[PDB]
Amino acid sequence: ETVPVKLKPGMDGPKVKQWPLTEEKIKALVEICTEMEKEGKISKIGPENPYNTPVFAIKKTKWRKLVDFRELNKRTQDFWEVQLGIPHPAGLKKKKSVTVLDVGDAYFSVPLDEDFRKYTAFTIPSINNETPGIRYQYNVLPQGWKGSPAIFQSSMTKILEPFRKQNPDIVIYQYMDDLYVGSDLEIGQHRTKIEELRQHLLRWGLTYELHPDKWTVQPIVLPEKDSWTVNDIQKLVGKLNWASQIYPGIKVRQLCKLLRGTKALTEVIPLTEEAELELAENREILKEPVHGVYYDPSKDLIAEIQKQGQGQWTYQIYQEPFKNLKTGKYARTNDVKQLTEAVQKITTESIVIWGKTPKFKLPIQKETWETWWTEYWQATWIPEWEFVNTPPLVKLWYQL
Amino acid sequence: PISPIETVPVKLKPGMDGPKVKQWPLTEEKIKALVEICTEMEKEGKISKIGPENPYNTPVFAIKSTKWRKLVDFRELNKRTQDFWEVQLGIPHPAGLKKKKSVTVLDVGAYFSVPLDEDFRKYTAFTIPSINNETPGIRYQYNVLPQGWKGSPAIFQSSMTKILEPFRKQNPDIVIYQYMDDLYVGSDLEIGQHRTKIEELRQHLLRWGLTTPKEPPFLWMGYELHPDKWTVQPIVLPEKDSWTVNDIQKLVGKLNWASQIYPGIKVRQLCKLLRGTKALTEVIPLTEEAELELAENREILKEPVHGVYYDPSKDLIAEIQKQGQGQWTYQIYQEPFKNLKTGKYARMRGAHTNDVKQLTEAVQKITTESIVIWGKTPKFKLPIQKETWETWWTEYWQATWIPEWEFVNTPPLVKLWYQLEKEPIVGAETFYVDGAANRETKLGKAGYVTNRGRQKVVTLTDTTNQKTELQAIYLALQDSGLEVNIVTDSQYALGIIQAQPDQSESELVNQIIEQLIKKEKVYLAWVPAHKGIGGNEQVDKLV
Ligand SMILES: Cc1cc(/C=C/C#N)cc(C)c1-n1c(=O)[nH]c2cnc(Nc3ccc(C#N)cc3)nc21
């Protein structure tokens, strides 16, 4: 039996353009999709279906299909969030180890409500448009649709019920096609418990280690110097003054007034009295979290990312600008590959902390990103993103 | 014949009923003409007549040579019909096709041979009105795909695809494509074995209710297809005494079309005349630049050029040359220098760019185009040194990545025309600059104070804060020596200048770029305004 699914009121199915695919990825999708069709998971459709969501091939050594249901997810957000929502446990971020398991194969056993299937249409393009794209819709719960875990919630609870009862201190959280399993066990016992869980899932047709406990803040750092030029203090005042917009308490005047008159930038300046001391307060202010910034569950998360050069990238997550919920860096063979890796890491952390993915403000030309991101993407979800032109010194203020 | 293919189910849009448009009365000639036309169509199964139970109706007309044409106006039905998947997502480009030995062309003259979903026919009802509109007219409905209905192209092409699929697997080495009333069938077989397999296809078409009774070069979609090469069908450039807007638009379209295979075509100077919306009939004198551009295009077009087809076993090489003033040109070949394709890139992405950003945007546009046409990115040969390119993208704040490339010494080379200093310049003067405009009056002041005691303030009319802040920086660069430190309060102007633009829509920004190139050293720094920061509050006073 199938759970009836409805779009948002007066909302139509997605009609999203397929991005061009290389021959190698087209050929991979074709073989994957013929095998799914012979197993009945998808079916060819005719022109009376005007819907489309995009599809790609990614890698784990063997190709895997990734459907971008971002648009559909938005147009079914009453179904998976306010009707069948999966609650997010505050305990998960406190655990010493969190293991992520793919459980998406679970969904291929559950049929999809036949009146919804047309909204899952997708196209395999052809090279040079020589042949009409191959067209398909889903017959089962598809991976990547936020409706799938919501409908499967009933069954996931029945699968996990023995393991949860026997391990009351382990937190198991489902997000899209993944299980997040967190314990305070020593790493060997934790791995052992993952193994037993794999065995529970294996009796129903279901076949990477985080340490949230060690996700330390990236505080705004201020230089410690022997001598201070005019230039040095100006950069310091600018950096403090921008910081003052997030951290109440930041003060700059004592530093400001040793810069009075119009002196050369190269002129060395000995610090004054509360001047040198205010570098102490200001330092003391900036190495601890923002007072009074709290997560609002009804608002979107935003992630901004700056390229710092030399393989390092800074990021901040917020809902209203300058009230950061989190700040960090990402460390260390291509600008796009590195950025693709930072996006996946930031999304995973924020699934763990809030059960929500952020919308990314990405410092890259749209077409470069869309042409390369799939060469390095390994997750089974896709966050929302948009393309931005990083303000010049925001990068200098988050520099280490 | 009406194909035995199964029908495509069709629905009206949710919440709507079929059309009920009233039939206007027509001339007796037009009623006679339509009874004749409809009686043949009824014999062949294309239409059926229906009682008055059916409440739906779509107007019908007839227009004339001595032919009479039926005209069913499906406007109301079309706006009540569901949407369909669209027919073509893109047109195959010739440069993506493979060499063919034999190419046949069967006649396949369409819609009236494909059945229409039984539950839908009633919405296609129409009425031949009686004379002087006194009795109720004769009422028909369609059984096939009606001409002019929204669903016909999509359902026809889908039907034509399922019919071909059997033959397309028993012959996975033969390509078949649909152009107008001809089907083009291509193989690497010789004429004997080729037209044997042509026969079995036509036999296979006949079994599905499709009748089939041209030599290269085939004229198609603007292109001229030959068995071993391809080009654009001939471009003739008029020799007008006088040019109208309309003539220049048609000429720009033709040069743009020719740029796919004729390398180095330029349209910038001709396009610049089309700016400032004026009448299509109005005459535009050609500037001397547009006449030199027109002259150059004519030499490029004097002798014919052709493109070669794609060899899937070899790499694609893409070459880009700078043609100047934001104009880029490129060729794609597999063996030098036999082009599959050429093109041009001439976009201003941004108000201010340099040649390095423009070259990367061009490589991005060529990369995407290669994926579409050939399914594969090419190897790039680019007029920029490897050192220039990694100096720029490592220091720059956006991410980028272009695929495999190699420097090629084809001048003009791409280079950064100046470099901002990394730290302040000992022994050079420090200017504290500042601009300001009054939002009411559009009046502003720009000026500086230096650590050496100088100071200047100019006044500005019809201006903005943004332009006074750039005016201040220009002031500083004029009055300083070969080395200079510049403190500004404008993130706006620092942002622009740190991106190392070498071109801009703003003549102000271009004048600053002029100055930055003559200088030997320039350090530029930013301070927040209104914090009483030494020289900045003091130059703030003046403006
Ligand atoms: C996209 C296309 C358009 C037309 C329009 C014709 C008209 N009018 C005809 C064909 C067969 C194809 N077509 C397709 O669908 N797959 C193909 C693979 N390779 C070739 N190559 C090729 C084609 C023609 C010649 C000639 N002369 C030489 C080489 N064409 C292909």
Residue numbers in the entry:
A (entry chain B): 6 to 65, 69 to 215, 232 to 356, 362 to 429
B (entry chain A): 1 to 64, 68 to 112, 114 to 217, 223 to 552
Quoted from the paper:
Reverse transcriptase (RT) of human immunodeficiency virus (HIV) is essential for viral replication due to its responsibility for the conversion of viral RNA genome into DNA. Thus, RT represents an important and established target among anti-HIV-1 therapies to treat acquired immune deficiency syndrome. RT contains two distinct druggable sites: the polymerase catalytic site that is available for nucleoside reverse transcriptase inhibitors (NRTIs) and their acyclic nucleoside phosphonate analogues (ANPs), and the allosteric binding site available for non-NRTIs (NNRTIs). NNRTIs target an allosteric binding pocket which is situated about 10 Å from the polymerase catalytic site. HIV-1 RT was co-crystallized with cyanovinyl compounds 2, 4, and 6 to determine the effect of the size of ring B on binding in the NNRTI pocket.
All three compounds maintain a hydrogen bond between the aniline nitrogen and the K101 backbone carbonyl. The potential for a second hydrogen bond between the pyrimidine core nitrogen and the K101 backbone nitrogen varies between structures. This distance is longest with the five-membered ring at 3.4 Å, suggesting that it likely does not contribute significantly to binding affinity. Due to an opening and solvent-accessible area around the core, there is water observed interacting with ring B in the five- and six-membered structures of compounds 2 and 4, but not with the seven-membered ring B of compound 6. The co-crystal structure with compound 2 shows the most dramatic change in protein conformation. Notably, the side chain of Y188 rotates away from Y181 and sits more parallel to the cyanovinyl. To allow this shift, sheets β9 and β10 move, resulting in the Cα atom of D185 moving 4.7 Å compared to the RPV bound structure. Because of this, several amino acid residues become disordered at the periphery of the pocket, markedly from residues 217 to 222. These protein movements are possibly due to the position of the carbonyl in ring B and/or the wider distance between the arms in the horseshoe shape. Most importantly, compound 2 exhibited significantly improved phosphate-buffered saline solubility (10.4 μM) compared to ETV and RPV (≪1 μM).
